[PDB]
């Protein structure tokens, strides 16, 4: 898991290696720039000091002339550094951008060259996160951090070299102090660089119950765990709060320690330097230049660690992409060493074919199948689901290879001939097709390259899918939505048949081509299928026997092996399995957030005080620095000079200690108030969303994951929106206001001159800060807005592995990649220019300020201590203003966040779950009466699913509801359970209308089983224990319900039997077992009204009886309503209701519906026996 460095710089041109070399040279130059500026600064301040000393003796002419000369060194260094910085940044960014574009295109090629078996095992999203995260990490690992790394190493080396060639004594002292300085700068950059992932994990620990309660929305009011899930969520928030508090405390400890160390080093270095300057051994400019070069060098070598971090990350993230690109499959679509026939005649040969799925290789579905199919032979295969008809279809197109035997098509085997040429000539429709979300002309064009619209019209008229083309607008320009959601299912399957038929194939393979289709359209589709079957070989897999009776050969699967063979009458005169089949068939808010942290006002007041002191900490440094220099700018007694120097060293130390305390306090207090606000806001938004109705979440914009992300991000952004603006404003005021004032008092002219520069210096500071770690994410946003095509061509590997059109989607990916690449190059150039210009203006401020200062000193208008004060108080004031106002989070998105949070908190549901008001009778009977009830979905207001049904249910009346899939089966459940209230109709619950009753009482009395069993992230004892709430749950009822649901055996078998931790949605254990535990979880409710919705969807035949015996012994006393597709619970039901498009067609006893032969008898004579 550590790529060798040479392997990553693969895909590098010669132009890119030239870019890298020249960028490294420019980076070294721009790095070594700064210690030379310190050199010139030392020489210049020495000039000023000697002029002052002499003019205080003779009690200023050559001063102006020598400053004239030094301005030229300043300007030269400024220009050279501007050029070197521009070159370094632009060249490194261009090299990395082009290299990463090449990497990404070649990686997509590799991820396309694979096979479905290698793609069906790995997760689909895994490759998505691999692409985005891995590629962006490779980009940042080689983009610029190498530039800044070499620049910081150059600054360190040149700084120590200058410090040694000037004076080696103070240099050895600052060297002895240097390792702790480097460590402090490294840790301080390390904690300011990321500031996201640790708090993200601290919240992710709690994101589990978030995803729990937002992944189980419907069943959560039946479970009624709102109070309990809210308690557990409060616990998780408490732990997250404690971890975040410890984070803030330790981070601010490290910050304060770094600043205390900086200031103690200032104190020691000035103490020793002034000892030498007073002992005549050193000058003041010399001590200044030696100290500034060594201190800056140590800080830079400290700041060059995140480059190493990002490079290690880039190697680690490139390992997997290189392994993907490195892998070559046995069969390559791109490879042209495959063999291609010419006289392609339809002949199928399978002999001794054994194959198992590599996802589950322990189970063997197939145990040998031998077939020989001639041309024009319509072969159908019949059998139950589990034998693998779809397995045989996937075995045909060489999606895999059989482990035993050899398959052949017309003499020669598949294993020596080309895969793509074979893949284009077999037109296959799968069971559930997928449609790409383009126009329908492109969709029907997707078979082959050069198809004109006349062949399109002939193919769609063969498919009989031109009428719905005729009725909708944009008859070749209609953009079908995601996964065929815009159109209906029958139009979708008919145009899918068209999309296969445009290839003009040699072998046609249909797999369940008429699942959701009606009578006449399946008829005309099958007539068209016999219109094009005479030149081709065909295999049809279907459930309806209307299209099977007119075939050539019928065959039957049993346990994977094809057992029966022959024509219709041969299987009819043999009375086999199939015999039994045919015999049976015949914004809005503006700063109302100030009151959100109001209760923690001591934190706010101590924070504003500490911010005032931490802002004013700068002009005090200006004062002490200028005073300690002016002590050596004038003449005085040696002892007075030594006393002043010692006093100012002590003042440096004391200022450092104050800085430590105040940084700790401000950081801790603001972080603590922020975290308390985030906790109080997450708690409240979760409670207010739990108080909502099901109609609220069912809104199309109110999605689960989107809402957990809204919580995670906005509840942490609104804390900044309130605390950070105030803290930063106060910091910047106490930093720059008193600075401009003290400057105006002493030097009036130079203060105006530098006022004409402070904005650009602040801008340079903010830019340098945004460059230290993290500038912009917009490139990811462009790639994402253009990245859905790779997602869709990855997920739907199925259609692309057969259509033989992979290169077209690779070219589409290239067309998607083109324009962001041009924009990235233009942005690299612009960014280089801006960075260089800002740093150069920071380099030219020296020259301007000190030339005007020399002209002022020469004319007696001010001293040198004064110009030093104005400089160090105004220019560094503006630089600190920029540096600090950078770390502040921006304000517009924070405001939008607070607005939406307050909106959602403020929103109140029409029905309140916490209120007790309503009709509370002490008694009931258990009779339900629906009358003229109509319901339309709020997300689909134009489409009515109901047209006024009615129903009468009495005590103990086993009421079966039978109908088509999607005719309002669970809608009556949702009308009962107070999810949706209908616009019209009347529902009487024992002569008591549900709209006037208590809301929680109806949700307490009844108890259902969901359409899909969902459990929570705990053990099975807490799975069944969720069924009864606000009540002391007895374990005797737990074991009694586990015995009654016949899940007691599977619980008592498991180790840690009632403490066995179940994962998400019961993904560890099987579907029948979680269905039985859903039966046990509903069973503890003991409901007076019981509903079942698909009680035997995935369950064994011996388990259905042991589920139903508890139901039949407990159906007395309670009203029972079962909805299922299996007829075994429908035969013994009391009254049976058949639905048709929401309308009640037949009702009454089962013998009455069996007497009058209608649509129910149609479904009652399918598998009667």
């Amino acid at each position, epitope marked *: 898991p550590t790529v060798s460095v040479f392997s990553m710089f693969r895909y590098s041109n010669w132009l890119d290696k030239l870019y890298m070399v020249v960028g490294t040279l420019a980076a070294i130059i721009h790095g070594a720039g700064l210690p030379l500026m310190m050199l010139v600064f030392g020489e210049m301040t*020495d*000039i000023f000091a*000697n002029a002052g*000393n*002499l003019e*205080d*003796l*003779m009690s200023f002419m*050559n001063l102006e002339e020598d400053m004239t000369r030094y301005a030229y060194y300043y300007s030269g260094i400024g220009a050279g550094v501007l050029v070197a910085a521009y070159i370094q940044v632009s060249f490194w960014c261009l090299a990395a951008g082009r290299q990463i574009h090449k990497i990404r295109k070649q990686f997509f090629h590799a991820i396309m060259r694979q096979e479905i078996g290698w793609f069906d095992v790995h997760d689909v999203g895994e490759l998505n996160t691999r692409l985005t995260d891995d590629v962006s990490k490779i980009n940042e690992g080689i983009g610029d951090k190498i530039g800044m790394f070499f620049q910081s190493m150059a600054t360190f080396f040149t700084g120590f070299i200058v410090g040694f060639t000037r004076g080696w004594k103070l240099t050895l002292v600052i060297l002895a102090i240097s390792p702790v300085l480097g460590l402090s700068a490294a840790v301080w950059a390390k904690i300011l660089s990321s500031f996201t992932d640790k708090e993200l994990l601290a919240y992710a620990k709690a994101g589990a119950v978030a995803e729990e309660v937002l992944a189980a929305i419907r069943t959560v009011i039946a479970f009624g765990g709102q109070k309990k899930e809210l308690e557990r969520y409060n616990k998780n928030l408490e732990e997250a709060k404690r971890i975040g508090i410890k984070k803030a405390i330790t981070a601010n400890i490290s910050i304060g320690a770094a600043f205390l160390l900086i200031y103690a080093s200032y104190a020691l270095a000035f103490w020793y330097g002034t000892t030498l*300057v*007073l002992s*005549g*051994e*050193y*000058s003041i400019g010399q001590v200044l230049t030696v100290f500034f070069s060594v201190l800056i060098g140590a800080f830079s070598v400290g700041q060059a660690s995140p480059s190493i971090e990002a490079f290690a990350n880039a190697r680690g993230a490139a390992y997997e992409i290189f392994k993907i690109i490195d892998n070559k499959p046995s069969i390559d679509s791109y490879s042209k060493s495959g063999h291609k026939p010419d006289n392609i005649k339809g002949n199928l040969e399978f002999r001794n074919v054994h194959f198992s799925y590599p996802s589950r290789k322990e189970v063997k579905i197939l145990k040998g199948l031998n077939l020989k199919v001639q041309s024009g032979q319509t072969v159908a295969l019949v059998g139950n689901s589990g034998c693998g008809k779809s397995t045989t279809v996937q075995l045909m197109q060489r999606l895999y290879d059989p482990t035993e035997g050899m398959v052949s098509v017309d003499g020669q085997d598949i294993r020596t001939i080309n895969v793509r040429f074979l893949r284009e000539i077999i037109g296959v429709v799968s069971q559930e097709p997928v449609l790409f979300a383009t126009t329908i002309a492109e969709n029907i064009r997707y078979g082959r390259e050069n198809v004109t619209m006349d062949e399109i019209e002939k193919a769609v008229k063969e498919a009989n899918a031109y009428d719905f083309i005729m009725k909708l607008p944009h008859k070749f320009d209609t953009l079908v939505g995601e996964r065929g959601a815009q159109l209906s299912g029958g139009q979708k399957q008919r145009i899918a048949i068209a999309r296969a038929l445009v290839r003009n194939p040699k072998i046609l393979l249909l797999d369940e081509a008429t699942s959701a289709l009606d009578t006449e359209s399946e008829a005309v589709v099958q007539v068209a299928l016999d219109k094009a079957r005479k030149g081709r070989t065909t295999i049809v897999i279907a459930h309806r026997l209307s299209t099977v009776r007119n075939a050539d050969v019928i065959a039957g699967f049993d346990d994977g092996v094809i057992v029966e063979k022959g024509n219709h009458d041969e299987l009819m005169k043999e009375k086999g399995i199939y015999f039994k089949l045919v015999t049976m068939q015949t914004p809005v808010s503006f700063w109302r957030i100030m009151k959100l942290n109001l209760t923690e006002w001591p934190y706010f007041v101590v924070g504003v005080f500490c911010a005032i002191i931490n802002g004013g900490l700068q002009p005090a440094f200006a004062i002490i620095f200028s005073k300690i220099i002016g002590v*050596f700018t004038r*003449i*005085d*007694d*040696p002892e*007075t*000079k030594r006393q002043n120097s010692n006093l100012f060293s002590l003042l440096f130390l004391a200022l450092g200690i104050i800085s430590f305390i105040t940084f700790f306090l401000q950081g801790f207090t603001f972080g603590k108030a922020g975290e308390i606000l985030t906790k109080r806001l997450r708690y409240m938004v979760f409670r207010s969303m739990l108080r909502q109705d099901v109609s609220w979440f069912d809104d199309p914009k109110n999605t689960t994951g989107a809402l957990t992300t809204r919580l995670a991000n906005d509840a942490a952004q609104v804390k900044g929106a309130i605390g950070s603006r105030l803290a930063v404003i106060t910091q910047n005021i106490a930093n720059l206001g008193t600075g401009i004032i003290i400057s105006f008092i002493y030097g009036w002219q130079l203060t105006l001159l530098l006022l004409a520069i402070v904005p650009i210096i602040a801008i340079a500071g903010v830019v340098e800060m945004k460059m230290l770690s993290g500038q912009a994410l917009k490139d990811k946003k462009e790639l994402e807005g253009a990245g859905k095509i790779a997602t869709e061509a990855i997920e739907n590997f199925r259609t692309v592995v057969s259509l033989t059109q992979e290169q077209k989607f690779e070219h589409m990916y290239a067309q998607s990649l083109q324009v962001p690449y041009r924009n990235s190059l233009r942005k690299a150039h612009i960014f280089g220019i801006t960075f260089s210009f800002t740093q150069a203006m920071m380099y030219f401020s020296y020259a301007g300020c000190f030339r005007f200062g020399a002209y002022l000193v020469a004319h007696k208008l001010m001293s040198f201590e004064d110009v030093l004060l104005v400089f160090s108080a105004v220019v560094f004031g503006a630089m600190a203003v920029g540096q600090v106002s950078s770390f502040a989070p921006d304000y517009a998105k924070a405001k939008i966040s607070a607005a939406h949070i307050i909106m959602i908190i403020e929103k109140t549901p029409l029905i309140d779950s916490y209120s007790t008001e309503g009709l509370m009778p002490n008694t009931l009977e258990g009779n339900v009466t629906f009358g003229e009830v109509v319901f339309n979905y709020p997300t689909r207001p134009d489409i009515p699913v109901l047209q006024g049904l009615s129903l009468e249910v009495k005590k103990g009346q086993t009421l079966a509801l039978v109908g088509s899939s999607g005719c309002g089966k669970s809608t009556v459940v949702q009308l009962l359970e107070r999810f949706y209230d209908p616009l019209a109709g009347k529902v009487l619950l024992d002569g008591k209308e549900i709209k006037r009753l208590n809301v929680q009482w109806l949700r307490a009395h009844l108890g259902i089983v969901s359409q899909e069993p969902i459990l929570f992230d705990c053990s099975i004892a807490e799975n069944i224990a969720y069924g009864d709430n606000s009540r002391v749950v007895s374990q005797e009822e737990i074991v009694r319900a586990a015995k009654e649901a016949n899940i007691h055996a599977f619980i008592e078998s498991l180790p840690n039997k009632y403490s066995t931790k179940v994962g998400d949605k019961g993904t560890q254990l099987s579907g029948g077992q979680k269905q039985r535990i859903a039966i046990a979880r509903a069973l503890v409710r003991q409901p007076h009204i019981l509903l079942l919705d698909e009680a035997t969807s995935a369950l064994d035949t011996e388990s259905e009886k042991v589920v139903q015996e508890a139901l039949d012994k407990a159906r007395e006393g309670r009203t029972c309503i079962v909805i299922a597709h299996r007829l075994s619970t429908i035969q013994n039901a009391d009254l049976i209701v058949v639905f048709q498009n929401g309308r009640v067609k037949e009702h009454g006893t089962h013998q009455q519906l069996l007497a009058q032969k209608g649509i129910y008898f149609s479904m009652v004579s399918v598998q009667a026996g």
Partner: antibody
Amino acid sequence: EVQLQESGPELVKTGASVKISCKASGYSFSNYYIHWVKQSHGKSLEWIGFISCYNGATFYNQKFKGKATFTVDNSSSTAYMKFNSLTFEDSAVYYCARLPIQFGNFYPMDYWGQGTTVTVSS
Amino acid sequence: QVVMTQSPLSLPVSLGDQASISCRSSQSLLHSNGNTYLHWYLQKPGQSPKLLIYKVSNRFSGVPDRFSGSGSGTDFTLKISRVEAEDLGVYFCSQSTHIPPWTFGGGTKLDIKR
């Protein structure tokens, strides 16, 4: 441990020019001023002037201005004093002395040159 | 333009007893800051003058402590304790508080008093 030493005697004739040399070792030349001081025979010492060893700026006593020129050589760490048309009154012993630049007359002349006696003769 | 006057132009001293040399300034040798600058140097025949006692009463690093100096206003004095035979030369004083032109004294030689 600072050691300045001078050239040595120079028996020159009237109306001529002579250069006197003070060589300083063992310390930082860039800081101190070098002070030139005259001493006739059997009389009190007399101050001639000072040369800034840093950039070469000078100051002359009123009597001696226009009769003496001070120069400095940094790479050689030496100071030079030259007369112009020296008379009979300039036969004396001359001294160079050290004085730091930070203190500036609040400190003594710590270290002295050994002294080189000039003599005018025809 | 202060004018120092070193009282004895020669001091007949023996070896084993002590002497005292005194300088009188024509002006007050205090300073506006509050310190007095009057340094005493020693010169030997054919050598360079050394610094014996700088400032008011302070002693230069690298000299013994036999030498001492006390004074006030416009009258100062040096004192040699346990006089030896090596520390027999010319002395002089030097004013530095009013320095347009530096001022020195006339000096004093010592004797052996035979």
